[PDB]
Design a protein around this ligand. Structure first.
Ligand SMILES: *[C@@H]1O[C@H](CO)[C@@H](O[C@@H]2O[C@H](CO)[C@@H](O)[C@H](O)[C@H]2NC(C)=O)[C@H](O)[C@H]1NC(C)=O
Ligand SMILES: *[C@@H]1O[C@H](CO)[C@@H](O[C@@H]2O[C@H](CO)[C@@H](O)[C@H](O)[C@H]2NC(C)=O)[C@H](O)[C@H]1NC(C)=O
Ligand SMILES: *[C@@H]1O[C@H](CO)[C@@H](O[C@@H]2O[C@H](CO)[C@@H](O)[C@H](O)[C@H]2NC(C)=O)[C@H](O)[C@H]1NC(C)=O
Ligand SMILES: *[C@@H]1O[C@H](CO)[C@@H](O[C@@H]2O[C@H](CO)[C@@H](O)[C@H](O)[C@H]2NC(C)=O)[C@H](O)[C@H]1NC(C)=O
Ligand SMILES: *[C@@H]1O[C@H](CO)[C@@H](O)[C@H](O)[C@H]1NC(C)=O
Ligand SMILES: *[C@@H]1O[C@H](CO)[C@@H](O)[C@H](O)[C@H]1NC(C)=O
Ligand SMILES: *[C@@H]1O[C@H](CO)[C@@H](O)[C@H](O)[C@H]1NC(C)=O
Lengths: 49, 48, 119, 173, 49
């Protein structure tokens, strides 16, 4: 979760970060895709029967 | 004279095969051929 | 691994055609394969039939097609014309000739008959 | 190498191939299954900011012709057209050979020809119905397009941020 | 290549089971394969040596 890492539970830090657009969503989507991909990898390699 | 032209691609020639109930095409001769296939293996080692 | 150290049956993998063998050669940051392939040349038309019914018993070819000229019938390997005289050695029997579609009539010569006649 | 042509005769040993062969009574040459898949699966705004979408080199009709040629070659000459020239062969003999390739003797095909043809026809009918009914069977394609589109959207959205300046409109500043 | 222009013996490569043939079909930005496969149906016990 970006806002917790970049900003140390600060209000003005989050307010400034909000000016940078949707950078966090791309990272979150990529990591979620990676996790689902790992799950699919295990399912495909093992569940042959 | 010579000039630059533009046209529509041709996906090779047009061919037809005489299919039927009881016709078979059997070869009588052959040809040994040699074909080249080139693959890259590695790049140039570098560092900065 | 496959093309050099063996004969692979994968289509269009080692060469374009029926693969035979290969030779590797080096190149600056790369490799070059010379694939030796076998390609069928000029072909000829023929008349065929799925099976042969000799004495009410359908006959099937052990390996090959039933090729037929305008007059006679032979058995040939699929990738090269090589006629052979029909014999019980290169054919086997499976049932009667009623369920098979395309059956034809022709005699099937037997090799034992001449020498049993001589004896 | 060469575009093949299926013969007008449809005597393929009882194997009904009408579903996948090219459709003559259609503006294009796409088959019933092909058209079903095509039916199964805002643009100006992105172009308005310098994001152009080029057209593919091979149009759909050329791909359809290539596919039709491949099917015609497979159903007429077996596999012999892959290696060298095309060698016509009866379809029943080809099916007997394809059985012989997997251990079973060829005679089985000539003992159950009609049953096998009926089974294959029922199978193609069932797969056509399955494609007609549900829409998720083409998920692998759909996701791709969606994924791509999503990226572009974000790019355009990035034009709305200020990045710390007074305003995001270049003409304004 | 393998499935259409031949009879691949690689298990589970073209379809699920003993492979016979395949038919390609076009699709928007993709390709579809219809594999024809042979599978046994009825099983019988026997004593062997
Ligand atoms: C198969 O083809 C080869 C080559 O085409 C024939 O061998 C000879 O090859 C030389 C070199 O090109 C030609 O000048 C000769 O004319 C070829 N022989 C003949 C009889 O034409 C070979 O004979 C052919 N075999 C068959 C059975 O057709
Ligand atoms: C068809 O091909 C066969 C095989 O080459 C020809 O062979 C004939 O076989 C009979 C049976 O032994 C002989 O009596 C003939 O003398 C053979 N023919 C020749 C030319 O020697 C057969 O002639 C061919 N039939 C045709 C061309 O109509
Ligand atoms: C092959 O030969 C058999 C018998 O020699 C033929 O069987 C005859 O078929 C006719 C019909 O065409 C029947 O009226 C006869 O009763 C059948 N038996 C006999 C002894 O003549 C057969 O038609 C021939 N041709 C094939 C099988 O294609
Ligand atoms: C092969 O399958 C096609 C497709 O089902 C059959 O054509 C159908 O025939 C029925 C008969 O009334 C019509 O209602 C359908 O509209 C036809 N479908 C199409 C797509 O035209 C055909 O009869 C089958 N057999 C042969 C030999 O083609
Ligand atoms: C194939 O056989 C059918 C029925 O036996 C016949 O009507 C048709 O004309 C035949 N085709 C050819 C090309 O001989
Ligand atoms: C075989 O027959 C077809 C049609 O009858 C003909 O066009 C062709 O020239 C013949 N010879 C071949 C294919 O060698
Ligand atoms: C073979 O025998 C076993 C044990 O008796 C049984 O469980 C099994 O169902 C039998 N196989 C078939 C196909 O009936």
């Amino acid at each position: 979760d970006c806002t917790m890492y970049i900003c140390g539970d600060s209000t003005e830090c989050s307010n400034l970060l909000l000016q940078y657009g949707s950078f966090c969503t791309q990272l979150n989507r990529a990591l979620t895709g990676i996790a689902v991909e790992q799950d699919k990898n295990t399912q495909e390699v093992f569940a042959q029967v | 004279s010579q000039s630059i032209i533009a046209y529509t691609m041709s996906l090779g020639a047009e061919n037809s095969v005489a299919y039927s109930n009881n016709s078979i095409a059997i070869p009588t001769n052959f040809t040994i051929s040699v074909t080249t296939e080139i693959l890259p293996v590695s790049m140039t080692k570098t560092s900065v | 691994s496959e093309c050099v150290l063996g004969q692979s049956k994968r289509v269009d993998f080692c060469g374009k055609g029926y693969h035979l063998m290969s030779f590797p050669q080096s190149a600056p940051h790369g490799v070059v394969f010379l694939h030796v392939t076998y390609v069928p040349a000029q072909e000829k038309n023929f008349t065929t039939a799925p099976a042969i019914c000799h004495d009410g018993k359908a006959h099937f070819p052990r390996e090959g097609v039933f090729v037929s000229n305008g007059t006679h019938w032979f058995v040939t390997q699929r990738n090269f014309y090589e006629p052979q005289i029909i014999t019980t050695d290169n054919t086997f029997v499976s049932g009667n000739c009623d369920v098979v579609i395309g059956i034809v009539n022709n005699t099937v010569y037997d090799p034992l008959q001449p020498e049993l006649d001589s004896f | 190498k060469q575009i093949y042509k299926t013969p007008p005769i449809k005597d393929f040993g009882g194997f009904n191939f009408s579903q996948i062969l090219p459709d003559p009574s259609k503006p294009s040459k796409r088959s019933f299954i092909e058209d079903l898949l095509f039916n199964k699966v805002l643009i100006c705004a992105q172009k308005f900011n310098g994001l152009t979408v080029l057209p593919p080199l091979l149009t759909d009709e050329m791909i359809a012709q290539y596919t039709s040629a491949l099917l015609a070659g497979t159903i007429t000459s077996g596999w012999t057209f892959g290696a060298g020239a095309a060698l016509q062969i009866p379809f029943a003999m080809q099916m007997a050979y394809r059985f012989n390739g997997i251990g079973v003797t060829q005679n089985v095909l000539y003992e159950n020809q009609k049953l096998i043809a009926n089974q294959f026809n029922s199978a193609i009918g069932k797969i056509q119905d399955s494609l007609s009914s549900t829409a998720s069977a083409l998920g692998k394609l759909q996701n791709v397009v969606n994924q791509n589109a999503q990226a572009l959207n974000t790019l355009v959205k990035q034009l709305s941020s200020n990045f710390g300046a007074i305003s995001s409109v270049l003409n304004d500043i």
